[PDB]
Amino acid sequence: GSHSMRYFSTSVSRPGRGEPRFIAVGYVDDTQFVRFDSDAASQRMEPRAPWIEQEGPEYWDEETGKVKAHSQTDRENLRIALRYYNQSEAGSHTLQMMFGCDVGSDGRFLRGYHQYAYDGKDYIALKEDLRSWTAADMAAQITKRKWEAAHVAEQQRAYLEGTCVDGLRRYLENGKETLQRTDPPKTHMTHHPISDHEATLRCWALGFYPAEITLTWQRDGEDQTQDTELVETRPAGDGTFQKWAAVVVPSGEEQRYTCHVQHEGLPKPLTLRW
């Protein structure tokens, strides 16, 4: 199937307590592989997956250089945002950035991303055509005008369609045993009476990879959207993921309910019934 590489950065200002802390992480699909933390002692991009540890000293030198440069850029950007938004120098603010690319099963470029958020809301983003920007508000429109004039998009376009793609394909090959695997969910149901007339059914999916999955409850074959409690997919810690969906049902009527599980590791969706 297709694959993605994403880098996520978070800069947080802390007036009084020194310069903004900058943390960056890199992922291929749902597997993290690098990190950088401006507060850490090393001041280095660091490995966080076994298949990247093999990269030579020059890799680690260059990546560290690149990510430190980003760190300074977003430090400057935080100060500019203060100005644009007419905000006090006393407050703490957040600048987040995400970039990366998707490739098809044949390694071909599929899409590129380059986007920013300020205090948790869209600021500016490169559109899919990789030639234009979408600005969220009047402040970001200032940036948009500057970046259009300076042709900032053309560069990003390049990296996105070149370096980014090459890196992903390289990582996908080196980490083949990890990254090109699918682990199907192991499923089960639990059941707990909650009163004399109602019981909980909980449908579990465990040990699956990648994280994408769909769990749906039906009653007599009809989806039960609004009454299902569905938790966010969560990491097990071993590189696989977990999820459950529960419904409260009238006691004695458990058999009317079916849980449906869809995941790329399953040839056919599973149906579970208590």
Binding site: Y7, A24, E63, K66, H70, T73, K146, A150, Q156, T163
Partner: peptide, 7 residues
């Protein structure tokens, strides 16, 4: 590979 403009 990480990427190689101010607001």
């Amino acid at each position: 590979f990480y990427r190689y403009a101010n607001f």
